[PDB]
Design a binder for this molecule. Structure first.
Ligand SMILES: *[C@@H]1O[C@H](CO)[C@@H](O[C@@H]2O[C@H](CO)[C@@H](O[C@@H]3O[C@H](CO)[C@@H](O)[C@H](O[C@H]4O[C@H](CO)[C@@H](O)[C@H](O)[C@@H]4O[C@@H]4O[C@H](CO)[C@@H](O)[C@H](O)[C@H]4NC(C)=O)[C@@H]3O)[C@H](O)[C@H]2NC(C)=O)[C@H](O)[C@H]1NC(C)=O
Ligand SMILES: *[C@@H]1O[C@H](CO[C@@H]2O[C@@H](C)[C@@H](O)[C@@H](O)[C@@H]2O)[C@@H](O)[C@H](O)[C@H]1NC(C)=O
Ligand SMILES: *[C@@H]1O[C@H](CO[C@@H]2O[C@@H](C)[C@@H](O)[C@@H](O)[C@@H]2O)[C@@H](O)[C@H](O)[C@H]1NC(C)=O
Ligand SMILES: C[C@@H]1O[C@@H](O)[C@@H](O)[C@H](O)[C@@H]1O
Lengths: 208, 210, 208
């Protein structure tokens, strides 16, 4: 301390005109002895002044947390612009600098595959519906589930995992009551990624 | 300023296999060139032990040393929750640094293992994905491998454990095989080792269905 | 003078990770005049200090028995490490050293075969399920039975028998109610051995 963490936008914030992507600069372990924090922001090395800095917030471990948020243009993030947060504090020998950008490398479109429950799981009261998303680059991605136009919320999805060919994959597991699966209800896995056309794709799954 | 200590647990394949040696690893970084010697004292449930293995120091790029001591733990001791303490002494430290490590606490829960064949739409590709779903296990320490007709198979990747809504963990392991190997009827096996299994091992097989 | 006997661990203590294998150094004929006994222990020539010495026990013939117990690492015993107990006593002209190790020789993987009851045994209220385990080396092995994820405890296993080719074989007999066998219940013979892949294999048996 003080230490700085620079966070990227959320994957869905970059992909839809609907949402506002922005980069977040977090300073932790600010001592009560040195409460002042100054933020300077750079986009491709050019100083910018539109960042919104919040007032310091006291933490339970008797240190301050200070957050500055820079609202980022959609196309700028996807085109690989560089965002640098410069953090100044009197307890620092020199200011702390962090830089973030989207991963470089040619984007690769995710391949989406839905997998029904394993035969041995059909014995249980609730079954697992699986969505395999593989071969995508970069790793920023979002996955959701629906049934009959309505969102399904009983799902958990793994973080991206680096594959042997340089792309990423993950799995999403949706849990439903077995009865819903044998009624023949249709379930859909939704994937959001910059390499998809219109940044969206869908794959459905139902009893065969 | 000063050396820092990091204490690492044994790995789940070392702990669960009788022929391997599970080890607790005590790592000291930021060891200076002027005072490079590090003395390690090890304790199991507070009693000093003397079987630790000293590794050769390794010079780092920022002109400091990394110094490591490795304690082999009894298989049954680690699984019974004994506490392992590494005490690190160095002439640049005003007082020795102590770190303690133990196995994750909580009621153990047995993994459920399910194999999933490739998606119908993936069969058009030259390579297909065999999926192993491992769920409902606690703690998260687990090992997963793949075999083919009993033989080790290595083009697989396994996700990290993910916390489920009920407090247990799950993961997926993905094996990639040539379509022709799947279409020949070869049997593929997902093998998992976990402390909550009887015999600490279980396997589920998968092959082309008629 | 005193005599020393060095005993190996119990074979199943080495094959189960939750069990504790130990080598035991026993000294008998320790005199009343020279009661002091010192133990030094070595693993592959390296002295170790974790041995537990028991208190002297006076015997009926007016001599002492003194025992020291060394816990061996599972992998150390199985990898063929050599254990030396060195015993010093003032009545000995020179210390007595005893060495013990696992049987050497190429490990050979067990072949596991299940055998249903003989037709003539079906007249009885209880039947014998047989597990034949053959061709294994060394003779250290463990056999258990399960049904439907649960242990079956009504079994007995023969000791290993040396076969004509230098390997060992044994038989395990599980006794079950005939009705359980005729219901189609599946029974499994589980064996643990260092030469098996994953040190484990299982063979099932049910009404044909
Ligand atoms: C007082 O209480 C506050 C609570 O607010 C604490 O603040 C917390 O401080 C934590 C650090 O002490 C923060 O933890 C970080 O959280 C990030 C979570 O996203 C995470 O990304 C960070 O992980 C990186 O840095 C770690 C080192 O600190 C590494 O262990 C880790 O592997 C990560 O390292 C990066 O790795 C990638 C590749 O994988 C590299 O590309 C990066 O360059 C690496 N980063 C580098 C080298 O810097 C870390 O876990 C936590 O966010 C924060 N909480 C909040 C709400 O802000 C104070 O610590 C606490 N202080 C005391 C004294 O109690
Ligand atoms: C000094 O450098 C050590 C080396 O750590 C490794 O190498 C550097 C270059 C990075 O890649 C780092 O992420 C690696 O883990 C560090 O162990 C040590 O913390 C460093 N100490 C200081 C004070 O910088
Ligand atoms: C003295 O006796 C020691 C103990 O004898 C053994 O244990 C007792 C409990 C009896 O069961 C006895 O029959 C056993 O043989 C022996 O270890 C030792 O050899 C004996 N020595 C002499 C000289 O008699
Ligand atoms: C004091 C700390 O502040 C916040 C959290 O990220 C930590 O878990 C802790 O509560």
């Amino acid at each position: 301390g003080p230490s700085v963490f620079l966070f990227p936008p959320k994957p869905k914030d970059t992909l839809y005109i609907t949402r506002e992507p922005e980069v977040t600069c977090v300073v932790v372990d600010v001592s009560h002895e040195d409460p002042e924090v100054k933020f300077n922001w750079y986009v491709d090395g050019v100083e910018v002044h539109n960042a919104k800095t919040k007032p310091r917030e006291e933490q339970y471990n008797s240190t301050y947390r200070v957050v500055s948020v820079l609202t980022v243009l959609h196309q700028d993030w996807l085109n690989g612009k560089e965002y640098k947060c410069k953090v100044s504090n009197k307890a620092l020998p020199a200011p702390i600098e962090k830089t973030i950008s989207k991963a470089k490398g040619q984007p690769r479109e995710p391949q989406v595959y839905t997998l029904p429950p394993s035969r041995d799981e059909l014995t249980k009261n609730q079954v697992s519906l699986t969505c395999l998303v593989k071969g995508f680059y970069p790793s920023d991605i979002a996955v959701e589930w629906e049934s009959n136009g309505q969102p399904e919320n009983n799902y958990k999805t793994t973080p991206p995992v680096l594959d042997s060919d340089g792309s990423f994959f993950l799995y999403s597991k949706l849990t439903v009551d077995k009865s819903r699966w044998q009624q023949g209800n249709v379930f859909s896995c939704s994937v959001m990624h910059e390499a998809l056309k219109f940044h969206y794709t869908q794959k459905s799954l139902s009893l065969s």
